[PDB]
Design an enzyme around this catalytic site. Sequence first.
Site, short mmCIF file in Angstrom:
data_model
loop_
_atom_site.label_atom_id
_atom_site.label_comp_id
_atom_site.label_asym_id
_atom_site.label_seq_id
_atom_site.Cartn_x
_atom_site.Cartn_y
_atom_site.Cartn_z
N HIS C 64 56.25 -13.95 4.85
CA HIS C 64 57.34 -13.77 5.80
C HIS C 64 57.94 -12.38 5.71
N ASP C 94 50.29 12.06 29.56
CA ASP C 94 49.90 11.16 28.48
C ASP C 94 50.12 11.85 27.13
N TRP C 129 57.08 -9.44 -2.14
CA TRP C 129 56.77 -8.30 -1.28
C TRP C 129 56.50 -7.06 -2.11
N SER C 159 47.36 3.56 10.50
CA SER C 159 47.85 3.47 11.87
C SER C 159 49.18 4.21 12.05
N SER C 160 50.10 4.05 11.09
CA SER C 160 51.40 4.70 11.19
C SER C 160 51.29 6.21 11.03
N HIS C 243 62.63 3.36 0.22
CA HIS C 243 63.85 3.76 0.90
C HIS C 243 63.69 4.64 2.14
N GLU C 245 61.30 3.93 4.15
CA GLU C 245 60.84 2.84 5.01
C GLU C 245 61.98 2.15 5.73
N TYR C 247 64.80 3.31 6.51
CA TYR C 247 65.42 4.08 7.59
C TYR C 247 64.49 4.21 8.78
N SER C 258 72.65 4.33 21.93
CA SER C 258 73.31 5.47 22.55
C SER C 258 73.10 5.46 24.05
N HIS C 292 68.23 3.40 -7.08
CA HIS C 292 69.30 2.41 -7.03
C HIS C 292 68.77 0.99 -6.87
N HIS C 293 67.48 0.83 -6.58
CA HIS C 293 66.85 -0.48 -6.69
C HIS C 293 66.51 -0.83 -8.13
N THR C 318 76.79 8.41 8.67
CA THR C 318 76.74 7.22 9.51
C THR C 318 78.08 6.96 10.20
N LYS C 321 78.34 8.79 13.51
CA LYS C 321 77.68 8.09 14.61
C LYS C 321 78.51 6.91 15.11
N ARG C 440 67.57 -15.00 -7.20
CA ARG C 440 66.62 -14.90 -6.10
C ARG C 440 65.29 -15.56 -6.46
C1 HEA Z 1 67.77 -2.32 6.59
C2 HEA Z 1 67.84 -1.05 6.22
C3 HEA Z 1 68.77 -0.66 5.15
C4 HEA Z 1 69.98 -0.02 5.31
C5 HEA Z 1 70.65 0.44 6.58
C6 HEA Z 1 70.53 0.17 4.08
C7 HEA Z 1 71.71 0.74 3.81
C8 HEA Z 1 72.16 1.05 2.57
N1 HEA Z 1 71.57 0.63 1.42
FE1 HEA Z 1 69.92 -0.33 1.16
N2 HEA Z 1 68.82 -1.91 1.08
C9 HEA Z 1 67.82 -2.19 1.96
C10 HEA Z 1 67.60 -1.42 3.07
C11 HEA Z 1 68.60 -0.84 3.77
N3 HEA Z 1 69.71 -0.36 3.08
C12 HEA Z 1 67.11 -3.40 1.61
C13 HEA Z 1 65.98 -4.05 2.37
C14 HEA Z 1 67.66 -3.82 0.46
C15 HEA Z 1 67.25 -5.02 -0.34
C16 HEA Z 1 66.31 -4.56 -1.45
C17 HEA Z 1 65.12 -5.47 -1.61
O1 HEA Z 1 65.22 -6.46 -2.30
O2 HEA Z 1 63.90 -4.94 -1.48
C18 HEA Z 1 68.69 -2.87 0.13
C19 HEA Z 1 69.49 -2.95 -0.96
C20 HEA Z 1 70.32 -1.98 -1.36
C21 HEA Z 1 71.00 -1.92 -2.54
C22 HEA Z 1 70.97 -2.97 -3.62
C23 HEA Z 1 69.80 -2.73 -4.58
C24 HEA Z 1 69.80 -3.81 -5.62
O3 HEA Z 1 69.46 -5.06 -5.28
O4 HEA Z 1 70.35 -3.61 -6.67
C25 HEA Z 1 71.74 -0.76 -2.55
C26 HEA Z 1 72.62 -0.32 -3.63
O5 HEA Z 1 72.69 0.85 -3.95
C27 HEA Z 1 71.48 -0.10 -1.34
C28 HEA Z 1 71.97 1.06 -0.88
C29 HEA Z 1 72.30 1.21 0.44
C30 HEA Z 1 73.44 1.93 0.98
C31 HEA Z 1 74.53 2.65 0.24
C32 HEA Z 1 73.36 1.82 2.31
C33 HEA Z 1 74.32 2.46 3.29
O6 HEA Z 1 73.56 3.31 4.16
C34 HEA Z 1 75.17 1.56 4.18
C35 HEA Z 1 75.96 2.54 5.05
C36 HEA Z 1 76.92 1.84 5.96
C37 HEA Z 1 78.17 2.20 6.03
C38 HEA Z 1 78.88 2.76 4.82
C39 HEA Z 1 78.95 1.98 7.30
C40 HEA Z 1 79.63 3.29 7.70
C41 HEA Z 1 81.02 3.02 8.21
C42 HEA Z 1 81.98 3.90 8.03
C43 HEA Z 1 83.18 3.86 8.93
C44 HEA Z 1 81.96 4.83 6.85
C45 HEA Z 1 83.24 4.66 6.05
C46 HEA Z 1 83.14 5.38 4.72
C47 HEA Z 1 83.25 4.73 3.59
C48 HEA Z 1 82.73 3.32 3.46
C49 HEA Z 1 83.67 5.47 2.35
N4 HEA Z 1 70.61 -0.86 -0.56
C1 HEA Z 2 62.26 -8.07 8.72
C2 HEA Z 2 63.51 -8.44 8.43
C3 HEA Z 2 63.85 -9.85 8.20
C4 HEA Z 2 63.99 -10.84 9.14
C5 HEA Z 2 63.82 -10.66 10.62
C6 HEA Z 2 64.32 -12.02 8.51
C7 HEA Z 2 64.53 -13.25 9.05
C8 HEA Z 2 65.10 -14.30 8.40
N1 HEA Z 2 65.25 -14.34 7.05
FE1 HEA Z 2 64.88 -13.00 5.71
N2 HEA Z 2 63.74 -11.99 4.55
C9 HEA Z 2 63.57 -10.64 4.68
C10 HEA Z 2 64.11 -9.94 5.73
C11 HEA Z 2 64.13 -10.45 6.97
N3 HEA Z 2 64.39 -11.80 7.14
C12 HEA Z 2 62.71 -10.12 3.63
C13 HEA Z 2 62.24 -8.70 3.46
C14 HEA Z 2 62.43 -11.17 2.82
C15 HEA Z 2 61.58 -11.17 1.58
C16 HEA Z 2 62.42 -11.08 0.31
C17 HEA Z 2 61.52 -11.27 -0.88
O1 HEA Z 2 60.32 -11.35 -0.72
O2 HEA Z 2 62.00 -11.09 -2.12
C18 HEA Z 2 63.10 -12.31 3.40
C19 HEA Z 2 63.08 -13.56 2.88
C20 HEA Z 2 63.92 -14.54 3.28
C21 HEA Z 2 64.14 -15.74 2.67
C22 HEA Z 2 63.48 -16.21 1.40
C23 HEA Z 2 64.33 -15.72 0.22
C24 HEA Z 2 63.53 -15.74 -1.05
O3 HEA Z 2 62.54 -16.42 -1.13
O4 HEA Z 2 64.08 -15.24 -2.17
C25 HEA Z 2 65.07 -16.44 3.40
C26 HEA Z 2 65.58 -17.78 3.08
O5 HEA Z 2 66.72 -18.08 3.34
C27 HEA Z 2 65.42 -15.62 4.49
C28 HEA Z 2 66.27 -15.85 5.51
C29 HEA Z 2 65.91 -15.50 6.79
C30 HEA Z 2 66.09 -16.27 8.01
C31 HEA Z 2 66.72 -17.63 8.11
C32 HEA Z 2 65.58 -15.53 9.02
C33 HEA Z 2 65.59 -15.93 10.48
O6 HEA Z 2 66.31 -14.93 11.21
C34 HEA Z 2 64.21 -16.09 11.12
C35 HEA Z 2 64.38 -16.27 12.63
C36 HEA Z 2 63.97 -15.02 13.39
C37 HEA Z 2 64.63 -14.58 14.44
C38 HEA Z 2 66.04 -15.05 14.70
C39 HEA Z 2 64.15 -13.34 15.15
C40 HEA Z 2 62.91 -13.66 15.98
C41 HEA Z 2 62.31 -12.37 16.49
C42 HEA Z 2 61.72 -12.29 17.66
C43 HEA Z 2 60.95 -13.47 18.20
C44 HEA Z 2 62.13 -11.19 18.61
C45 HEA Z 2 60.93 -10.37 19.05
C46 HEA Z 2 61.40 -9.01 19.51
C47 HEA Z 2 61.15 -8.57 20.72
C48 HEA Z 2 60.90 -9.51 21.86
C49 HEA Z 2 61.34 -7.11 21.03
N4 HEA Z 2 64.69 -14.45 4.45
CU LIG Z 3 67.60 1.34 -1.23
#
Ligand code: HEA
Ligand code: HEA
Ligand SMILES: [Cu+2]
Lengths: 48, 58, 535, 269, 236, 63, 353, 75, 117
Positions: C64, C94, C129, C159-160, C243, C245, C247, C258, C292-293, C318, C321, C440
């Site tokens: 999943h 094209d 994963w 592909s990417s 990380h 990825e 973004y 926008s 930080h992971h 951010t 924006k 987890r």
């Molecule tokens: C989906 C894409 C995505 C995005 C957008 C981000 C956004 C950020 N992530 Fe990442 N992150 C992931 C992907 C992403 N992350 C994923 C998938 C995980 C799970 C890891 C996994 O298990 O593999 C993870 C988990 C994760 C962790 C936990 C790691 C762990 O489990 O220990 C951390 C901690 O450092 C982190 C960092 C951040 C930070 C600081 C941001 C920031 O960019 C968030 C920024 C948002 C804002 C801050 C809003 C801005 C609003 C304002 C008005 C600013 C105001 C100013 C202040 C707040 C001072 N991320």
């Molecule tokens: C890609 C981002 C993503 C998405 C979409 C989701 C979708 C959901 N995820 Fe998350 N989830 C992850 C990120 C994401 N998850 C990741 C990375 C893991 C793995 C973590 C691990 O391996 O450690 C995970 C695993 C995970 C687990 C298992 C946790 C574990 O085993 O430790 C669970 C269980 O509660 C959960 C919750 C859900 C639920 C209820 C949804 C529901 O939202 C599902 C329903 C889906 C929809 C609501 C959207 C349908 C989309 C389309 C049909 C739209 C198509 C688009 C176009 C037409 C343009 N997710």
């Molecule tokens: Cu990160």
Amino acid sequence: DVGPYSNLPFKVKNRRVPYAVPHFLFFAIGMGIPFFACYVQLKRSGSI
Amino acid sequence: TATEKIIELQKFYQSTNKPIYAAHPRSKYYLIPYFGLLGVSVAATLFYTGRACFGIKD
Amino acid sequence: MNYINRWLFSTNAKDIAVLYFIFALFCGLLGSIMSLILRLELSAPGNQILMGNHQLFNVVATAHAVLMVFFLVMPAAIGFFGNYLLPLMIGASDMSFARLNNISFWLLPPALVSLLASALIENGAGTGWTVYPPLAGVQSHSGPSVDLAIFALHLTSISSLLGAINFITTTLNMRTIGMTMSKLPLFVWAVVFTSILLLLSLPVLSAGVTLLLLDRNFNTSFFEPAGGGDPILYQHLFWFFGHPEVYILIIPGFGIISHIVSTYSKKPVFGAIGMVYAMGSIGFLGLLVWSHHMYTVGLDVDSRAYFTSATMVIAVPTGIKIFSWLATLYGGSIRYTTPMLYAFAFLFLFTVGGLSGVVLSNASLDIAFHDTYYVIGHFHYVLSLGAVFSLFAGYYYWSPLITGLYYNNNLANIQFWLLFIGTNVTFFPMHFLGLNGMPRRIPDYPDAFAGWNAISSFGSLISIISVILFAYVIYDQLVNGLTNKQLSTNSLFKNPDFIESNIIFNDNSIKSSSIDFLLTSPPLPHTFNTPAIQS
Amino acid sequence: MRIQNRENLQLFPFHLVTNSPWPLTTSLALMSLALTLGLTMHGYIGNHLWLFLAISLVLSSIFLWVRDVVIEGTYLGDHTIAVRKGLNIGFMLFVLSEILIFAALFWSYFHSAMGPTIEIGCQWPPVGITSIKPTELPLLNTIILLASGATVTWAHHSILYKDRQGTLVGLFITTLLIILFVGCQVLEYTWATFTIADSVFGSIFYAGTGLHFIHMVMLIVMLAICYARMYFYHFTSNHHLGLETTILYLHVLDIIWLFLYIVFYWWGC
Amino acid sequence: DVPTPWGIFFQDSATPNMEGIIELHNNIMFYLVLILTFVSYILYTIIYNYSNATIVHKYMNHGQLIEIVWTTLPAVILLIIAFPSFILLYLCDEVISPAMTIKAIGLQWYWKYEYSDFINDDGEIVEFESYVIPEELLEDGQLRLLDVDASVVVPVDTHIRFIVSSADVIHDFCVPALGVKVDASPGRLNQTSALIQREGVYYGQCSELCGVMHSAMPIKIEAVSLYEFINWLDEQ
Amino acid sequence: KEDKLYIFWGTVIGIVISATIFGAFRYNRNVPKTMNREWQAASDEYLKSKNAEPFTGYSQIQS
Amino acid sequence: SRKLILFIVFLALLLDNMLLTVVVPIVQVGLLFASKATVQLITNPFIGLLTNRIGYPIPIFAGFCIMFVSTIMFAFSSSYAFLLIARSLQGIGSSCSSVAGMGMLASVYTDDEERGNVMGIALGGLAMGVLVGKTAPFLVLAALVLLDGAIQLFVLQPSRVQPESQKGTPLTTLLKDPYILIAAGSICFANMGIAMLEPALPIWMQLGVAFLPASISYLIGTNIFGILAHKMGRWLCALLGMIIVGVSILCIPFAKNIYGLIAPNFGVGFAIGMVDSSMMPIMGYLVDLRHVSVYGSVYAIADVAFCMGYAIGPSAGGAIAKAIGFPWLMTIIGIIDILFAPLCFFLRSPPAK
Amino acid sequence: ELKTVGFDARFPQQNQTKHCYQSYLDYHKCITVKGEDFAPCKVFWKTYNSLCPSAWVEEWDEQREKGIFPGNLKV
Amino acid sequence: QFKTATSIAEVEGLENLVGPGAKTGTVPTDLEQATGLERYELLGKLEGIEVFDETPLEAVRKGTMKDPILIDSYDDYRYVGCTGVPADSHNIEWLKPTTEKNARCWECGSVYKLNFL
Ligand code: HEA
Ligand code: HEA
Ligand SMILES: [Cu+2]
Ligand code: CUA
Ligand SMILES: [Zn+2]
């Protein structure tokens, strides 16, 4: 032949079998494959 | 005639009415073995990935 | 034969985007049913649906993760919206390398087959994963499952890479007569800044995966500690891809929002140069932080302090924006159509899911939240409610132009509200379960974690109903879609102004800031014969 | 645009490719290669003549692409000034990506060289592994590479002064000055004391100097197709992009080898 | 301690490090609540006032003062957050004289505890293995998937150093109340320190994935007084 | 005015269906022996003798 | 612990070259461009005596505060005299920071093999300032790192004045030694050519892509040859570095296009990196062999030899370019750099004392 | 009265994998010379019996008795 | 395939652009080997004629309905982007003039007419 039903890979109107069957079977296979995988790997490991 | 057939094959690839990969009278020798062996290579990895899901080994 | 030379042996860039959409729909259905399988097992304490098998729970979670990080969000955000819209926005006929576009499509159906065949020949691939080295060896997973799953992360990488080089090469020398690279629209900048990270991140992943393969099957011992290696090296070589990825998944969303904010609120975007500089800063500061992971692996005390400092800095670009989107929506007139509903539901939920990232950035606070459901609740508010919402908004924005067939407004609104309610019910008690201490990747849990798991199993059944209603919306779009343009005035791209009369408006209907909405709507196969002119 | 009969010719300088079947066949060959290599390594097939068919079909698929790339440029005549710039930008963005694979492998060397574990008694090249002396055959390869970098400059400066015998001879000498590198480095892999499985040291030494081997078979092929396409009069004095890409690929490999010789062969303590 | 059924917030503390963690989290939540309320009020004003409006201010698109105010004001918040985070990172650790060492080795699906001191002249080191009690063999009142057969028994008001490693795969030692979360990777030793202020029982679970039996591997720590610890150590 | 009623009564009949589906997966459950009141009252005595949750609360009773 | 000092020195050198080079996006021009380098050249020997008196950490943060207040006075300055005063205080702050930071890296890392690696990492900040948008993320990242440094140095443990336990040799005794001067001359004559090449390049011949390959090559060169210089001998690295600088300098007059400068510029920057990371640790080695171990005045001499090129460069380079021209200037500096390279062999084994 | 190893500032970090190995090597170096019953070579014995797991010591002793041991025990 | 051109006044298609041949033992010149849209640029640049124009829109005078700006095209439509009379005042607004209707640019007001060549 450029028009509103020309850029799609599948034919929609003036068709023998109506479009509901190919539209439904696509989603049926898409939400039926990961139950078949769980069924196979459950039956290979003893449990019902 | 000479090694400058470049001014001769440029009047052939233009005005051909066939695609480029099958225009010369030599593309048979490249295209028949390639498409022949590709249909064996693909048909062998769809027999050994279905035999192997059933647990059969060699 | 004309079917083959036009939908299998193709050159046109806009005809591969529709195939990308059809592939992405299937690969987003499969993972959602796999998520419903997981959430119907994590409902009440005991062993309910999977009888005693803790394998075929980790396999479902792995498959999943992979089917929606690699097979849904990237093909939709790169193939359907990047291949189709970028030549029309920059004004090209094209792409520069069309055969590479065709191979970048056709490498993915062989990548689906190997992943689906990594869950039938054996116990399976329950490595998670992140395919960590000492579990995914030949002592726990001894079979053709992990090997066929790390060959599905090579073809997607190729592909990417081939798509990203095409995107960078096209926008440099295939523009129109009067466009410099400072008058480009924001979506082109989003695609460029994700295509640079795709170059700079994927070799490290390919190297780490290949060295894991050589450790598994050619007894090399890069990451085995009985020969002089460390597993932690792999973690470095994974997260340097990881990380960038996350973004890559979110930058093409931003630009889409926008356009909607620029359109249905009739104002230009506040500070476009600040926005492209903010995207550049976010793209650059996603490469200097990856550890930080990994705060609990045993790092130094002077290295955690660097990675807490370099992680909270990303909040500064951010916010520019977000506040610029608010300043764009402030003064103008707002009409609530179905793209702007998803636009309004993205500016609030990305903020909520992103403010949790500041709490997790500290190394002192990560001792209480690592490998806990707080992380899951953090990244589902941003992945499911930030990227999928942008995808739905982009579909409901650009589908009448591409297809030529309109849709029912009421059913789309019902779908949006069902998604909103069900997804906000599903991922909010995960914060409470994380704060109380639930780890987890566990099938069975102690009896104290029962009650919230009863509530998060209820929203998933709401969201699947919304997916089925989306399927019916597509069916009602394709059949009788010519007669769905007089039901509501949502079909109009822009509304009449206060002084603009209706008779004047019917003569001059479309006012735009891009080339997109002035084309005939089926777009022509060859859409530019004579070049476009910009002053 | 106000030239008289302008409607009869294309109004923008970009290449519209005709419909080709090769993207599908490359993917169908990589399907077979991936599944056969995943299966033969764990039983299930036994016979090792399906993997070789898969590799042969992949390489023939790239060769069949490059044929239609050549015919569209020397016969049809659709390569303007803009399309050549696009091809150069494209090749530079693959050379850059092929450099960054070596960065990860170099960082996999310095993460173990500086700070070795306790299982190996803390020492590079560890006890019982005799390394390769860098005052032997790894000097000959370096001087052959520096000579091959010098001989192709006599080949690119003889096609601009319109001397034909002087472009063929230099390319011939370079092609025999890369075959000797492979022949020397296959003799240094049969007279060694340590294998791929004998340490973390024997495992990273045959994984950074083995990718270079595969990358230098490609120069032998790319220089054969540059000698053979010059013998049959395809190269003019101002429109040659096959030579320019083979020159940029050779020099990057020379610079990479000069970093695989100070870090891998000399520095051990 | 034990998890509570409908939990909202943290478990209760028995270590100064966990109290510092709670105080830092409650310090950050102030600024995050302020930012969320500001954004929500601006969207409420936008929805209530400027919806379906006749007048469009389509020339307010530049800004010069206001773009500095949303660039410098978040930075000050980051400095104020970053001061106690660095103080908590550096200050609260084993600065002076740990008084015991317990090695907690993680095997495949159980735990192995060695109390490395109290050595006789022949090597009579006290050692035990902790397993999980199955559901069929539970007695009346024991907690399912958390209760063990042998528990780690430590004194109160004593610095304890845990050295964690593993023999098979990557594990993760966790007791949530005590503020201990460190990995267990198979070729290196890691250390944490804990001081316990009150008696009781403290429960924990493994975190990093290890295979099929990931959900059955608990940790249980009892904090007896010194007299009971001496009487317990003369029996094992 | 006759469209917002349609959207409201379309969302209600989207929430009612999921409740009836989730109820069917709620009667047919595997309930372990620990989830009974006479078992969660024996756990409170053990958590009372060894003083646990002094500040907030301990209660394992959720029927 | 010990790595936070490395972070502080890296940021100090980054802010040094950022406030030196980057003045235009963020004769009178000859005097105004060289106002910083000469005042740094004058006030460098005083800080080497000051760090023996009051200790290492206080001049670093004093220089940071002086640099901040001088930049903020330079922000809204219109008159010429106040602008000259502001750039003078900017230079005198930047003279304290680099000297005291390099001395404290010399003091903490006592082992000879680690010192070369750490200074090879630390010298990489001299090109990131040349390479370096909005820049407000990076300034607050720097502010966070210096907050961490201030917390560890002044808050958790008390700090008094605390003069050093041993008394160092004076500056004239160091200047009477031949080895320290001839080590400093290598850095001076290596940096002189790249100092003079910058103003005469708009005369001969967009702007950023000419300078980018040197900034790319410098980091790679210093981070690789900081580690590997211990086994190869530092004198050999200095000799090869001066040779490659000379050859790449003579490669420029044969080039007749802007795109032909990319390949020699790499051959500049990597080479001068292998000049720096080889030769700046070994000065701190020599005092450990022949004198008493106080590292302040010696790195003051090293910073003098570094900044002499930037002080003398543009003012003499414009006069030579008006007099003779670009290619003969490049020819004479290349022959000087090649001719200096034989005599660096003398540092193989100095006589101990 | 519950006494263990102190700080040992040459190894201040969280990875104590070098302290174990250094204590083991130092004990066997000071027991090859200066006899087997001598007083400061029981500081090292209590040092590596307080940090190292027992299976590592058993494997190292077997590797020493087979002659096959990567280390610097020869002074 | 037919008579070869010498200047671009004698080029009526792709049938007049093959050229003569090189001789045996000589590196060929581009005037002896070029066929397609490459030789057309070559015959343009040795006279001074730019075949592929890169000159932007007229930004000097406005547009009245009596005196409109004439945009030249070989089709019935051409996409024209207006951004102002001082060339950066008006934002980017795109328009499609046609042979049956003139565009008029809702913000500044310039009128565009299509000249069919
Ligand atoms: C989906 C894409 C995505 C995005 C957008 C981000 C956004 C950020 N992530 Fe990442 N992150 C992931 C992907 C992403 N992350 C994923 C998938 C995980 C799970 C890891 C996994 O298990 O593999 C993870 C988990 C994760 C962790 C936990 C790691 C762990 O489990 O220990 C951390 C901690 O450092 C982190 C960092 C951040 C930070 C600081 C941001 C920031 O960019 C968030 C920024 C948002 C804002 C801050 C809003 C801005 C609003 C304002 C008005 C600013 C105001 C100013 C202040 C707040 C001072 N991320
Ligand atoms: C890609 C981002 C993503 C998405 C979409 C989701 C979708 C959901 N995820 Fe998350 N989830 C992850 C990120 C994401 N998850 C990741 C990375 C893991 C793995 C973590 C691990 O391996 O450690 C995970 C695993 C995970 C687990 C298992 C946790 C574990 O085993 O430790 C669970 C269980 O509660 C959960 C919750 C859900 C639920 C209820 C949804 C529901 O939202 C599902 C329903 C889906 C929809 C609501 C959207 C349908 C989309 C389309 C049909 C739209 C198509 C688009 C176009 C037409 C343009 N997710
Ligand atoms: Cu990160
Ligand atoms: Cu055992 Cu986790
Ligand atoms: Zn206008």
